[PDB]
């Protein structure tokens, strides 16, 4: 299907965008958009790709669900990426909202790679 830069959106496109910037990472397996991020690994991995001096992904781990998340929102929202997901929530529950998470993700991917123009 052809699309003249008319709101670029897709499932694979994303799962790939993240797996790409994290291609040369350790412990980064974007298998799902609920758990894979539940902790906040991919979130820190991505931000680390562009600016590895923004987070501590260098010495991070899946043992941190709230932090890993907070750290991200702190950096991403630092450039101007409105925060949609919360770090605590992830802990308050077991599995996050695929719909929500994905939504927030698209934003980040959009920032670095222009595309969607909401508003």
Find tokens 């941190």 and name the residue. 64
Q: How was this structure determined?
A: NMR
- Domains of the chain, by residue range, sit at 3-114
* Displacement of CA 79 from its chain's centroid (Å): 14
d(CA 29, CA 108): 18
Find tokens 């910037």 and name the residue. 21
d(CA 103, CA 49): 21
Q: Which fold has domain 3-114?
A: Actin-binding Protein, T-fimbrin; domain 1 (1.10.418)
Angle at 92 between CA 75 and CA 70, to 5 degrees: 10
Please report how many Cα atoms fall inside a 13 Å half-sphere around the Cα of residue 41, on the Cβ side.
19
d(CA 38, CA 59): 18
Q: Tell me how far CA of residue 110 lies from CA of 8, 26, 39, 68, 99, in angstroms.
A: 9, 24, 22, 21, 17
């Amino acid at each position: 299907g052809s699309s003249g830069s008319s709101g670029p959106n897709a499932s694979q496109s994303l799962l790939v965008w993240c797996k790409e910037v994290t291609k040369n990472y350790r412990g980064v397996k974007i298998t799902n958009f609920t758990t894979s991020w539940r902790n906040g690994l991919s979130f820190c991995a991505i931000l680390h790709h562009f600016r590895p001096d923004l987070i501590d992904y260098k010495s991070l781990n899946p043992q941190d669900i709230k932090e890993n998340n907070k750290k991200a929102y702190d950096g991403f929202a630092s450039i101007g990426i409105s925060r949609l997901l919360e770090p605590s929530d992830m802990v308050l529950l077991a599995i996050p909202d695929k719909l929500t998470v994905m939504t927030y993700l698209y934003q980040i991917r959009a920032h670095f790679s222009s595309g969607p123009s909401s508003g």
